Symmetry: D2
Subunit: 461 residues, 4 copies
C-alpha cells in the first residue's frame, strides 16, 4: 500500500501509486490545516512553466544534459495539460516560502520522468529532484516566480478583459440614456437634474480609471525572481541564467516576463503583489459603489426609488411570492467586501519580510488570485445578467424629476440665493409647488418662472 | 529667539530652552522626532502619568524607600499637571520611541525640575528630586506607559463612551415605544417587503446598541489590569515587595476607578491585547452605528423624490448652491466616525501582533488610535442624540401610501392559498399596474371576504391569529 | 440528460438525476463566481438541523401534517449524515440573503422526500418546497440561523478546544522552564533577566485572556433568528414557534441555542458575527506574536539567537542542504494574517445592512467559518509539531545572559542610576566585566557585587 | 460677546470679533466632535487657491465685477499668508460633503472683504457669501477640488522628496558596503552569503518601485472637479469656466492641474484618493520591512544579531542605565501601521458614495493628508538620525558569516545535494565545523574545501 522514499531526514512511507516522494508526504501529514490540497492550481501550473524553463535554460548553458531536459519537459507538459492534478496534495498553510510545494514539483517530476523513461515507481529515479529538477534553483526564487506568472496571467487574461467588457456596457448605456433627464441626489436628498446617461458615464469613467491603475502595476508584476536562488545572489546559477530562463517563461506563457531588476527586492518582499492588489482593491471599491447605485435606482417596484428596470433572473424570496431582488448587485458588493479584506491580509503580510526572504508567500498568492478571479467572474456575471439589460422606468423618472424642490437652483442667477431659498422653503412647508410660491411670495412672475425653470436646460451640454 | 541653559543625561550636554521645566531627554526627543504636529502625545496619557507618578511616590514612601518630603514635592508637581497648569511642558509627539520612554522621561524631568522650584530652588540647579532615582523609583517606561494607556483608556470608555452610547440607546428605545402603533412597509434587498411597525424597526437599533454596550463592558476586566510593578521586563526588578498591589491601590484612590494590578506582568508589557480586545468592541459598536445612521438618512431621504418615511430635525442649510436644501448631516458625521474606527481597528490589530520578546514597542500609536475611537464615538453619539435621534417623527401620510402600495402584502395569503397562487396575484398586479385585491378577484383566486379577512397590515406585524 | 422543473418565473432544464430543482439550477447557472459548490458545508449541515426543527415545531403547533414532517426529517437526517453532499452546487457569491441556498435545501428535501415515499424524481413532490419544507420560514431568518448554528458549533467544538490545548502546553512549558534564567530583550536590545518559564507564562496568559474574550461573545452568538420570517415580525408563524423551534435545535445539536431577543437586530445585522470574529482576531494577533517569538528564539542554529530547540520535522530548503526552518511558526503567522483580513471583510459587511435585512450573509458566514477552522487547525498543528517539543539551549542561554551589560540595573537601588550608567559605560569602553569596573571605581566591593548582581535574584521584586 | 448673523434658516449668535457668520457658527456648535478646528489646514489653504481662481475666472467670463474679484483675492491672499488661521474653527466630523467648511470660506472671505473695503464687521457685506464668493460653485465640486490640490501638493512637495532622500541614502549605503560580505538569513535561519551592500540594494529598490507607483497615480489626482457644481452638470457656470478656473489654479499653485475628464466620477467618488493612498500604503509596507530589518540587524549589543552599528541618539531606558534603542526604526514602523489603517478607512469610505455624491470627503481628506505628511516626516527623520550613519560591525559580521553551516551550499555543484547535506548535518550533530567534517567523511579534500567554500565567491553566479 506504501513504498519507501528518503530525504535527508530519513525514510517516509509514501502512497505506493503516487508520484510524489518523502518531502511531499511529510508536508501532507504535518500541515493538516484547512481543506486538503488548497494550494491554488494556478501556482502548480506556473511551476510547470518555470520548471520546464529552468531545464531548457540549464541545457542551453551546458549544465544539464538534453536527455534530462526532455524528460523534465514531458512531465511539465503533463502537469500543464491537467494530467497530474492528483499529484499535488499540499495546503496553502505550509512553510511560508512554499519549499514544500517546490519539492512537490521536484519529486513528482523526478518520479514521473523515471516512468516516462521506462522505469518503475519505487526505483531510484534517473532524474534527481534536487540535483536535476531543481538545478540552479531555490524555493526562494521559484515560488515568487510562480506567484508572478499566475498573478500576471490571471490579471491580463481574466480580470482586465472582464472589467473592460463591463466598462464598455456602462459606456454604451451612457450613450443609450443620453436624453433621459432624471433627478440628481446628493446626501440622498433631492438635487438638480442630470441625464441617466451622465450618471452611467460616471460608472464607465470609474472603470476606465481603474483599468489604467491596474495596467500601471504590470511592469513591476512581470519581473521574475528566478535566478536569485537562496538569498538573491544567484549562487549556483550559470552566468546568463536569469535572462535566459525569463525568456523561456515568456515564450512558453506568451506573456512579457523579464528577469527582476533587483533579486533581493524579489525575494525579501512581495511589493509587486501589494502594488497590483491595491489597484484590484481600487476597482473593487468602484464596483461596490456602481452595484449599490444600481440596486438603489432599481428599488421598489412600488415603495422605493424605482428609476430603472433591471433583468428579473430568479425568484427573490422563499416566502414573499413574486418578489425579485437585485441579486447580481449583491454578488458584486460581497466580492468587493472580500477584496478589501484580502488587501488587509496582503498588505500586512507584505510588511512582514525578514532579512533575505518574505515567508508569507502562499497566503499572499492565494488571496491575490482569489481577488483577481472573483473580480473577473463577477464583472462577467454582472454584465451578462444585469448591466446589459438595464432600462429606464420613464414615468417614474419623470415624476421624481418634476417633484424636486431643488429645481429652484435654476433661479439663482435671476433672483439670488436667498430669494430662491424662500421659494423652496415655502413650498416645502405648505405642501405646494415651487411655481405656486414664487407667485404668492411676489418673487418671480408666473411668466418668468416658466421661462427660467426648465429641467432639460439644467444638464449642461 | 530662544534663551538656553545646559541639562545633561548619560549621553552628554543638551541646550534646553531656559524657562522650560523639561531637561536633556525631552529636548533630544523634541528635536529628533519632528513627525506630525508638535506635542501630539494625547493629553489623556499625560494626565494618566500625573496620577501614576503620584501613586508611585505614595506607594514608595509607604514601603520605606522614598522620604515623605520627596513624595510631597513629587505630588505637588503631579497635582500641577493634573490641574492643567503645565500643558506647555509636554512637547513630545506620538511618533517617538515605541515604548514611550521619552514621554516617561518628560514626566520625570518636569516633575524633578518643577519640584525643585516649588521647594525654592532655581531652574538650572541639579534638582533635589532625581528624575531616575526618585521620580522614576521602582519604575520603567515599560510598565508606566502601559499603565498610562489603561488608566486613560478605561477612564474614557467608562466616563465618556459608555454613557454616550447609553444615552443614544435610551432615545432609540423611547422612539421604539413612541412609534409602536405606526405600521410601515419593510424593505429587504431594498425591495418592497411585508409590514413592520416603525417602533419595531427602531427596536432593532436600540437592541444593537444594548448588545454593543454588553460587548464593551465584557472587555473591562482585562482593561482595568495595570502593568505597574513589572518594571524593565515584567519581573518587578527593583520594586519593593508589595509595590504592585499598593501602587494599584493608590491609582484606584486618586482616579476613583477600580484598577487592579495585572495578573501577568509579561502579558502586560509584551502585548497590548487588552487594547485590541476593548477596541474590537468599540469597532463592533461603530459598525452598528454606521447601519443605524445609514438607515435614518435613507428613511429621511427626499423630501419629495426619495423615501421620506421619517422627519428629522433641520439644523442648517445643506448646500451653498441648492437654496433651501437640508441634509442628514448628523447621520454623515456618525458614518464618517465609524469609517475612522474601522481603520483604527486595523492599526491597533496590526500593532498588537508586533510585540518582540519582553516588550510591545507600538505603545503610542495603539494609545492614540484607541483614545480617538473612544472619544469620537462618545462625541458623535451625544451629537446624533441631541441634534437628530430625539427629534425623529413619522411622516404619516407617506408611510401609509408606501405601506398600502407594496405587492408583498400578498404574503398574508400564503397559508390560505399557497405560495404559487399568491405569486400569480402579485405578478399579475405588477404586469397590469393594478391592486392585489382587484387581481385576486379578477383571477377568481380569492373571494372578497377572504382577501379582506386574510390581508390586514396590522395583523402582519406578529404571529398568526 | 435534463428534466423540466418550474418556478413562478417559468421552466428550467435541471440535470435529470439531481434532487435540486428550478431555483437551485438558475442560481448554479447565474452565479458562475469562484469554484463550484463553495457555500460552506457547515451552513448546509446547520440547515439540516433547522429544517428538521421547523418541521417538528410546525407539526407540534398543528400547521404541518405528521406524514410530511416525517419525510422532511428523514431527508434532513440524510443531509446531516453527509449522504447528499453532491446535491448542493451553489456558491458563496449568490444573492446576499442566501435565498438560493435556502431554496436548494427546500428543493432537495422536497424531491428526496418524494423518492423516500416511493415516488419518481421528476414528478411534482408530495412535499411542496415553499408551502411545506419552508412552512413558517424565510431565507431571512433561516440563513442567519444556519450561520449561528455553524459558527457556534465550530467555535465551541473546534476553535476553543484547540486554543485550550495550546494554552495548556504553554502553561506546562512555563512550569518546565521555571528555573531557566535567560536574558530579557526590549526593543530587540539586551535587557535584564527573566526565566524562560516567565516568558512562556506571558504566552499562556495571552491565550487565557483570548479564550475568555471568545467565551464572552457566545451569549449573543447562540441567539437564533428563526421565527422572524420575512422582516422580523414573525409573519406566518404559529404562536410559540420561535421558542419551540429553538428548543428543537438546542436538543438536536446539544448546544444552548435560544430564540433571539430582538428579531429585527437578528435579520438587519450580523453584529454577533462581528462580535465573535473580533475575539477570534484578538486570539490570532496573540498567536502571531507567540509564533514570531518562538521562531526568533529558535533562529540559527549558529548565526542567530538560538536560545531554544524546536522539533525539526522536514527539510527546510531545496538548495541549502541540511537547513531546517520553523515551518509551524510560519503556518500560524500566515493564518493570523488571514484572520485579520477576514475581520476587515466581516466588519465592512456588518456595517452594510439596509432597513430590515443585511444582505452580506454568505460572505460573512464563509470568512467567519474560515477563521474559526484555520485557528483550530493551526493551534492543533503547532501544538503537536512545535510547542510540545520546545526545549532550552542551556549553554547558549547562559552565554547570552552573562553577556548583558544591563545586569548593571541590579545596582541602581545601591549606587543610583548615574553611578550604574558609569559602571556600564566603563565596562563597555574597556571591554571588561561589570564586576571588574564596579570594584575598579570603588562603587561596590567584591562581596557586595556578588550578593547584589545575581541573575537568579533579578527575576522577582526586592527581598 | 456676540453679534447676530442670519442664514436662510434664521438668526445665529456669532462671536463678535470673528469674520465667520451664521453657517460656520451653526457647524461649530452642532458638531462638537473631537478637538476644535480639526479640518486640515492644507484643505483651508487649497480653498484659498480655488476661491481666488473662481473669482478670477468669473470676472474673465463676465459674471463677477472686477471690484469684487479684487476684494475676494485680497482676502484669499490673507488666508494663503496664514493671517486668518483663527477664522476656521470647524471639525473633520461635519457634513460629509464639507458644505460647512465651504461656507466657512465664503463667510470669512465676504466679511473680511467688507472690512478691507472700509466697512464694519456685522454690517451686510458688499460681497455676498453665496451669490459672489460662491458664484459658479458648489461644496460638491469645491471640496473635492481642495482635496486634490492639497493631496497633490503634499505628495509632490513633501512625500516624494522625503522618500527620494531616504532612497538615495540607501542606494549610497548599497554602494559603500558593496564589498562587505555577510551571512544571509531566510526564515530567520542561517543561509548563504550576500554583501551588506546587496542587502541595502534591496531596500533602495523597494523605495524606487514605490516612488514609481506613487508617480503613476498623479495623472488621476491632478484632475479637478471644479465646474461640476451641484451634480456634475456644471449648472450655473458660464461657458468655459471649468478649463479657465483649472488654468488659474495651475498658475497660482505652480502645479499641473487640469479639469476632470468626467465631473460625475469627480463628485460621486474619491477614487483618485483611493488610488494614490494605495501607493502611499505600498511605500509604508516597504518602509515597515526596511525599518524592522535595520533594528534586527542592530539588535544587541550581545543578545542579538549586531551586524550593523546605528547612531546612538538618546538614552533608551529610564531604568536600564546605558541602554540605547533603535528608536528611529520604531517611529517608522508605527507610522507604517497608521498608514495601513488609514488605507482601510479611505477604501471603506471610497466604496460608500450614493448617486451623485460621495459624502465621506472630510474623513478621506484627513486620513490621506496624515499618511502623506507622516511618511514624509518619518523618512526625513529616519534618514537624518539613522540611515545616513549606518556602519558595519566588521568582526560580528565575520563571525556570523564564518559560523553558517549553509556555506556548504558552495559544494552542491561539486559533490551533489545529498553529500553536502551529510557534511552540514554531521557538523551540526558533532558541534564541529564544515571543513573538519568534509575532511573526516572523505567527501572533500582540505585543498578543494578551501578553494570552493569562499564566501566572496558565493555572492554571484558560477565562474
Amino acid at each position: 500500500a506504501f513504498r519507501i522514499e528518503k530525504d535527508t531526514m530519513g525514510e517516509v512511507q509514501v502512497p505506493a501509486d503516487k508520484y510524489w516522494a518523502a518531502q511531499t508526504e511529510r508536508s501532507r501529514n504535518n500541515f493538516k490545516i484547512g481543506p486538503a490540497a488548497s494550494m491554488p492550481h494556478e501556482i502548480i501550473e506556473a511551476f510547470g512553466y518555470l520548471k520546464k524553463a529552468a531545464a531548457f535554460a540549464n541545457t542551453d548553458l551546458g549544465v544539464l544534459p538534453a536527455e534530462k531536459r526532455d524528460l523534465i519537459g514531458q512531465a511539465c507538459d503533463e502537469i500543464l495539460a491537467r494530467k497530474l492534478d492528483d499529484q499535488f496534495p499540499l495546503v496553502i498553510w505550509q512553510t511560508g516560502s512554499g519549499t514544500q510545494s517546490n519539492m512537490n514539483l521536484n519529486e513528482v517530476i523526478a518520479n514521473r520522468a523515471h516512468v516516462i523513461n521506462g522505469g518503475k515507481l519505487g526505483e531510484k529515479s534517473i532524474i534527481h529532484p534536487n540535483d536535476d529538477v531543481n538545478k540552479s534553483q531555490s524555493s526562494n526564487d521559484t515560488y515568487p516566480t510562480a506567484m508572478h506568472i499566475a498573478a500576471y496571467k490571471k490579471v491580463v487574461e481574466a480580470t482586465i478583459p472582464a472589467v473592460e467588457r463591463l466598462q464598455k456596457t456602462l459606456a454604451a448605456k451612457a450613450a443609450e440614456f443620453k436624453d433621459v433627464v432624471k433627478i440628481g441626489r446628493t446626501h440622498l436628498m433631492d438635487a438638480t437634474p442630470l441625464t441617466l446617461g451622465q450618471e452611467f458615464s460616471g460608472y464607465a469613467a470609474q472603470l476606465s480609471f481603474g483599468l489604467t491603475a491596474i495596467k500601471n502595476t504590470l511592469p513591476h508584476l512581470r519581473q521574475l525572481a528566478l535566478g536569485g536562488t537562496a538569498v538573491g545572489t544567484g549562487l549556483n546559477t550559470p552566468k546568463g541564467y536569469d535572462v535566459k530562463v525569463a525568456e523561456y517563461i515568456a515564450k512558453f506563457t506568451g506573456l512579457p516576463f523579464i528577469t527582476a531588476e533587483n533579486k533581493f527586492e524579489a525575494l525579501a518582499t512581495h511589493d509587486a503583489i501589494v502594488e497590483t492588489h491595491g489597484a484590484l482593491k481600487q476597482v473593487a471599491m468602484s464596483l461596490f459603489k456602481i452595484a449599490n447605485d444600481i440596486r438603489l435606482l432599481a428599488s421598489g417596484p412600488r415603495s422605493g426609488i424605482g428609476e430603472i428596470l433591471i433583468p428579473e433572473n430568479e425568484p427573490g424570496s422563499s416566502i414573499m411570492p413574486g418578489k425579485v431582488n437585485p441579486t447580481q448587485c449583491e454578488a458584486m458588493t460581497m466580492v468587493a467586501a472580500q477584496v478589501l479584506g484580502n488587501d488587509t491580509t496582503i498588505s500586512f503580510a507584505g510588511s512582514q519580510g525578514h532579512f533575505e526572504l518574505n515567508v508569507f508567500k502562499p497566503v499572499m498568492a492565494a488571496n491575490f488570485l482569489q481577488s483577481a478571479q472573483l473580480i473577473a467572474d463577477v464583472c462577467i456575471s454582472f454584465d451578462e445578467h444585469c448591466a446589459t439589460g438595464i432600462q429606464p422606468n420613464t414615468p417614474r423618472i419623470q415624476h421624481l424629476l418634476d417633484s424636486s424642490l431643488m429645481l429652484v437652483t435654476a433661479l439663482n442667477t435671476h433672483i439670488g440665493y436667498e430669494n430662491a431659498a424662500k421659494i423652496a422653503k415655502t413650498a416645502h412647508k405648505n405642501g405646494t409647488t415651487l411655481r405656486e410660491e414664487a407667485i404668492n411670495l411676489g418673487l418671480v412672475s408666473a411668466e418668468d418662472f416658466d421661462k427660467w425653470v426648465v429641467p432639460a436646460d439644467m444638464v449642461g451640454s
